[PDB]
Amino acid sequence: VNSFSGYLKLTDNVYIKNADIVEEAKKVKPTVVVNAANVYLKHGGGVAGALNKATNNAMQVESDDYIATNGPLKVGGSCVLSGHNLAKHCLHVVGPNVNKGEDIQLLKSAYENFNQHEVLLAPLLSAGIFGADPIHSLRVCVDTVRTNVYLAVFDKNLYDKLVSSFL
Ligand SMILES: CC(C)(C)[C@@H]1CC[C@H](CO)N(c2ncnc3[nH]ccc23)C1
Numbered sequence: 001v002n003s004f005s006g007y008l009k010l011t012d013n014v015y016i017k018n019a020d021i022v023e024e025a026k027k028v029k030p031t032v033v034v035n036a037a038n039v040y041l042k043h044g045g046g047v048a049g050a051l052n053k054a055t056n057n058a059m060q061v062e063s064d065d066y067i068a069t070n071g072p073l074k075v076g077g078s079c080v081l082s083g084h085n086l087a088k089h090c091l092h093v094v095g096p097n098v099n100k101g102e103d104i105q106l107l108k109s110a111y112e113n114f115n116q117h118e119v120l121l122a123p124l125l126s127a128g129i130f131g132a133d134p135i136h137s138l139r140v141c142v143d144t145v146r147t148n149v150y151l152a153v154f155d156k157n158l159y160d161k162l163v164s165s166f167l
Contacts, residue, residue, distance in 0.1 A: 018159035021152040022054045025086040034122035037092035039072040046129040055084040076109030098131030111144040119148045
């Protein structure tokens with residue numbers, strides 16, 4: 001039993017809700033919140049910009065030190081950093097950005113990072129400003145993640161389409 005509330009159950013391990021991931025994280029304080037990161041951990045917009053803003057830019061400060069030490073992530077890769085005031089940890093995961101021409105096949109590799117964590121609050125990878133089809137992202141999530149994932153979808157219209165079209 002966990003404290004996630006109001007989710008629709010899609011499969012044994014995947015749950016979905018129309019919610020603002022920032023507000024969800026602040027309420028639940030999950031062990032792991034997933035960020036829709038880029039390889040430079042520049043949290044300018046989309047989910048990343050919103051999460052970082054909620055940390056009063058502390059996420060960005062920590063991220064800049066991480067990059068200065070380690071260099072950029074790989075597309076499809078991840079790193080674990082602090083969750084600041086939102087979660088114990090933030091798993092920064094880089095899905096392919098279609099608006100940069102990146103290979104959508106890397107979306108499965110991106111979701112594989114979730115399997116290193118027993119329970120996660122997450123957005124749909126590569127959705128939103130990353131340019132991929134969110135219906136496809138949900139399919140890859142369900143077919144790749146085996147741990148317990150609670151998906152927050154900001155757009156109510158999109159949430160309804162994701163549910164109604166789910167096979
Ligand atoms: C449109 C984007 C590529 C930016 C993605 C797409 C999937 C959903 C749709 O809104 N996104 C979010 N989900 C949950 N919480 C969120 N907080 C802020 C954004 C957001 C944004």
